[PDB]
Amino acid sequence: IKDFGGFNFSQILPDPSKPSKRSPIEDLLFNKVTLADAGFIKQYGDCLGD
Amino acid sequence: VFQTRAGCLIGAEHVNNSYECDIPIGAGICASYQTSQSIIAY
Ligand SMILES: *[C@@H]1O[C@H](CO)[C@@H](O)[C@H](O)[C@H]1NC(C)=O
């Protein structure tokens, strides 16, 4: 990340100091939308117990 | 026995190298028939 002429691209380039190497705006978009499928491995014991 | 995010796969040999996808499995995993020949997952 060098002198671009005064241009900030930090909001759109990935942030190294965090996992998954994704942008802050991408973080916000990923947080706003909620999905019912947290994962894809739901075992027989999980459904039998609850 | 190899555990992926799409489930656990039985009958394939895991390899550290990366190639182009031939048969899509899911969750970033593909399989192919390669060389004394066997199925591999990568
Ligand atoms: C804009 O870029 C400078 C470095 O050129 C950085 O110090 C600053 O924090 C950036 N802007 C924001 C809001 O992070």
PDB file of C-alpha atoms and ligand atoms in Angstrom:
ATOM      1  CA  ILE A   1       0.000   0.000   0.000  1.00  0.00           C
ATOM      2  CA  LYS A   2       1.909   2.982  -1.373  1.00  0.00           C
ATOM      3  CA  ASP A   3       1.218   6.612  -2.216  1.00  0.00           C
ATOM      4  CA  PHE A   4      -1.685   6.543  -4.678  1.00  0.00           C
ATOM      5  CA  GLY A   5      -1.786  10.331  -4.946  1.00  0.00           C
ATOM      6  CA  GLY A   6      -3.915  10.928  -1.854  1.00  0.00           C
ATOM      7  CA  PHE A   7      -6.447   8.177  -2.559  1.00  0.00           C
ATOM      8  CA  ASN A   8      -7.747   5.941   0.220  1.00  0.00           C
ATOM      9  CA  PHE A   9      -8.554   2.423  -0.948  1.00  0.00           C
ATOM     10  CA  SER A  10      -8.468   0.929   2.559  1.00  0.00           C
ATOM     11  CA  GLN A  11     -12.249   0.575   2.675  1.00  0.00           C
ATOM     12  CA  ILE A  12     -12.231  -1.652  -0.419  1.00  0.00           C
ATOM     13  CA  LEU A  13      -8.920  -3.513  -0.233  1.00  0.00           C
ATOM     14  CA  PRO A  14      -8.639  -6.478   2.160  1.00  0.00           C
ATOM     15  CA  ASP A  15      -7.559  -5.751   5.726  1.00  0.00           C
ATOM     16  CA  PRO A  16      -4.523  -7.872   6.695  1.00  0.00           C
ATOM     17  CA  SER A  17      -5.080  -7.512  10.454  1.00  0.00           C
ATOM     18  CA  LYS A  18      -8.094  -9.861  10.490  1.00  0.00           C
ATOM     19  CA  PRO A  19      -9.002 -13.360   9.259  1.00  0.00           C
ATOM     20  CA  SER A  20     -10.450 -14.152   5.818  1.00  0.00           C
ATOM     21  CA  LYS A  21      -8.699 -11.080   4.340  1.00  0.00           C
ATOM     22  CA  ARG A  22     -11.822  -9.127   3.448  1.00  0.00           C
ATOM     23  CA  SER A  23     -12.770  -5.469   3.294  1.00  0.00           C
ATOM     24  CA  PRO A  24     -14.596  -3.510   6.026  1.00  0.00           C
ATOM     25  CA  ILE A  25     -17.499  -2.768   3.663  1.00  0.00           C
ATOM     26  CA  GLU A  26     -17.632  -6.479   2.847  1.00  0.00           C
ATOM     27  CA  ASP A  27     -17.709  -7.162   6.596  1.00  0.00           C
ATOM     28  CA  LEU A  28     -20.694  -4.848   6.975  1.00  0.00           C
ATOM     29  CA  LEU A  29     -22.562  -6.393   4.027  1.00  0.00           C
ATOM     30  CA  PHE A  30     -21.904  -9.896   5.356  1.00  0.00           C
ATOM     31  CA  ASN A  31     -23.256  -8.822   8.749  1.00  0.00           C
ATOM     32  CA  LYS A  32     -26.452  -7.199   7.446  1.00  0.00           C
ATOM     33  CA  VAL A  33     -27.768 -10.281   5.602  1.00  0.00           C
ATOM     34  CA  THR A  34     -28.767 -13.243   7.781  1.00  0.00           C
ATOM     35  CA  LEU A  35     -28.791 -16.836   6.524  1.00  0.00           C
ATOM     36  CA  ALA A  36     -30.615 -19.837   7.965  1.00  0.00           C
ATOM     37  CA  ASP A  37     -27.750 -22.158   6.926  1.00  0.00           C
ATOM     38  CA  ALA A  38     -24.953 -21.492   9.400  1.00  0.00           C
ATOM     39  CA  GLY A  39     -23.221 -24.672   8.231  1.00  0.00           C
ATOM     40  CA  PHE A  40     -23.875 -27.865   6.283  1.00  0.00           C
ATOM     41  CA  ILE A  41     -23.078 -30.670   8.773  1.00  0.00           C
ATOM     42  CA  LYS A  42     -26.054 -31.325  11.058  1.00  0.00           C
ATOM     43  CA  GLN A  43     -25.703 -34.805  12.513  1.00  0.00           C
ATOM     44  CA  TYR A  44     -28.312 -37.339  13.591  1.00  0.00           C
ATOM     45  CA  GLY A  45     -27.368 -36.845  17.237  1.00  0.00           C
ATOM     46  CA  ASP A  46     -27.943 -33.093  17.042  1.00  0.00           C
ATOM     47  CA  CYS A  47     -31.528 -33.528  15.826  1.00  0.00           C
ATOM     48  CA  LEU A  48     -32.194 -36.467  18.161  1.00  0.00           C
ATOM     49  CA  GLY A  49     -31.003 -34.563  21.229  1.00  0.00           C
ATOM     50  CA  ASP A  50     -32.909 -31.317  20.610  1.00  0.00           C
TER      51      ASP A  50
ATOM     52  CA  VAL B   1     -11.023 -41.312   5.129  1.00  0.00           C
ATOM     53  CA  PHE B   2     -11.014 -37.565   4.435  1.00  0.00           C
ATOM     54  CA  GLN B   3     -13.210 -34.927   6.089  1.00  0.00           C
ATOM     55  CA  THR B   4     -14.395 -31.911   4.073  1.00  0.00           C
ATOM     56  CA  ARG B   5     -16.962 -29.199   4.754  1.00  0.00           C
ATOM     57  CA  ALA B   6     -19.434 -30.967   2.450  1.00  0.00           C
ATOM     58  CA  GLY B   7     -19.079 -34.197   4.411  1.00  0.00           C
ATOM     59  CA  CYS B   8     -16.512 -36.945   4.705  1.00  0.00           C
ATOM     60  CA  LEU B   9     -15.241 -38.772   1.630  1.00  0.00           C
ATOM     61  CA  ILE B  10     -14.304 -42.466   1.576  1.00  0.00           C
ATOM     62  CA  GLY B  11     -12.333 -44.088  -1.228  1.00  0.00           C
ATOM     63  CA  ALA B  12     -10.106 -41.176  -2.284  1.00  0.00           C
ATOM     64  CA  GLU B  13      -6.509 -40.170  -1.571  1.00  0.00           C
ATOM     65  CA  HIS B  14      -5.797 -36.614  -0.442  1.00  0.00           C
ATOM     66  CA  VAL B  15      -3.023 -34.724  -2.242  1.00  0.00           C
ATOM     67  CA  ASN B  16      -1.359 -31.434  -1.314  1.00  0.00           C
ATOM     68  CA  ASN B  17      -1.025 -30.247  -4.923  1.00  0.00           C
ATOM     69  CA  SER B  18      -3.625 -28.171  -6.764  1.00  0.00           C
ATOM     70  CA  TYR B  19      -4.914 -28.848 -10.286  1.00  0.00           C
ATOM     71  CA  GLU B  20      -7.904 -27.753 -12.335  1.00  0.00           C
ATOM     72  CA  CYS B  21     -11.328 -29.050 -11.367  1.00  0.00           C
ATOM     73  CA  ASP B  22     -12.579 -32.167 -13.147  1.00  0.00           C
ATOM     74  CA  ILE B  23     -15.445 -33.517 -11.018  1.00  0.00           C
ATOM     75  CA  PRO B  24     -16.903 -30.949  -8.575  1.00  0.00           C
ATOM     76  CA  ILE B  25     -17.596 -32.143  -5.027  1.00  0.00           C
ATOM     77  CA  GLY B  26     -18.417 -28.962  -3.106  1.00  0.00           C
ATOM     78  CA  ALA B  27     -16.856 -26.567  -0.590  1.00  0.00           C
ATOM     79  CA  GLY B  28     -13.819 -26.039  -2.803  1.00  0.00           C
ATOM     80  CA  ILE B  29     -13.029 -29.728  -3.380  1.00  0.00           C
ATOM     81  CA  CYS B  30     -12.722 -31.557  -6.707  1.00  0.00           C
ATOM     82  CA  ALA B  31     -11.863 -35.128  -7.695  1.00  0.00           C
ATOM     83  CA  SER B  32     -10.176 -36.819 -10.647  1.00  0.00           C
ATOM     84  CA  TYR B  33      -8.976 -40.209 -11.892  1.00  0.00           C
ATOM     85  CA  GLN B  34      -5.182 -40.122 -12.124  1.00  0.00           C
ATOM     86  CA  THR B  35      -2.203 -42.473 -12.182  1.00  0.00           C
ATOM     87  CA  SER B  36      -1.644 -48.049 -10.797  1.00  0.00           C
ATOM     88  CA  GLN B  37      -4.528 -45.588 -11.137  1.00  0.00           C
ATOM     89  CA  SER B  38      -6.713 -44.282  -8.323  1.00  0.00           C
ATOM     90  CA  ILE B  39      -9.142 -41.514  -7.394  1.00  0.00           C
ATOM     91  CA  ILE B  40      -7.713 -38.364  -5.809  1.00  0.00           C
ATOM     92  CA  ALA B  41      -9.271 -35.351  -4.088  1.00  0.00           C
ATOM     93  CA  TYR B  42      -7.747 -31.883  -4.002  1.00  0.00           C
TER      94      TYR B  42
HETATM   95  C1  LIG C   1      -6.086   6.864   4.265  1.00  0.00           C
HETATM   96  O1  LIG C   1      -4.744   6.526   3.954  1.00  0.00           O
HETATM   97  C2  LIG C   1      -3.799   6.880   4.983  1.00  0.00           C
HETATM   98  C3  LIG C   1      -2.434   6.499   4.461  1.00  0.00           C
HETATM   99  O2  LIG C   1      -2.161   7.143   3.218  1.00  0.00           O
HETATM  100  C4  LIG C   1      -4.154   6.167   6.284  1.00  0.00           C
HETATM  101  O3  LIG C   1      -3.265   6.600   7.308  1.00  0.00           O
HETATM  102  C5  LIG C   1      -5.580   6.515   6.680  1.00  0.00           C
HETATM  103  O4  LIG C   1      -5.946   5.844   7.877  1.00  0.00           O
HETATM  104  C6  LIG C   1      -6.529   6.152   5.542  1.00  0.00           C
HETATM  105  N1  LIG C   1      -7.910   6.474   5.833  1.00  0.00           N
HETATM  106  C7  LIG C   1      -8.685   5.797   6.680  1.00  0.00           C
HETATM  107  C8  LIG C   1     -10.031   6.394   6.956  1.00  0.00           C
HETATM  108  O5  LIG C   1      -8.322   4.744   7.196  1.00  0.00           O
END
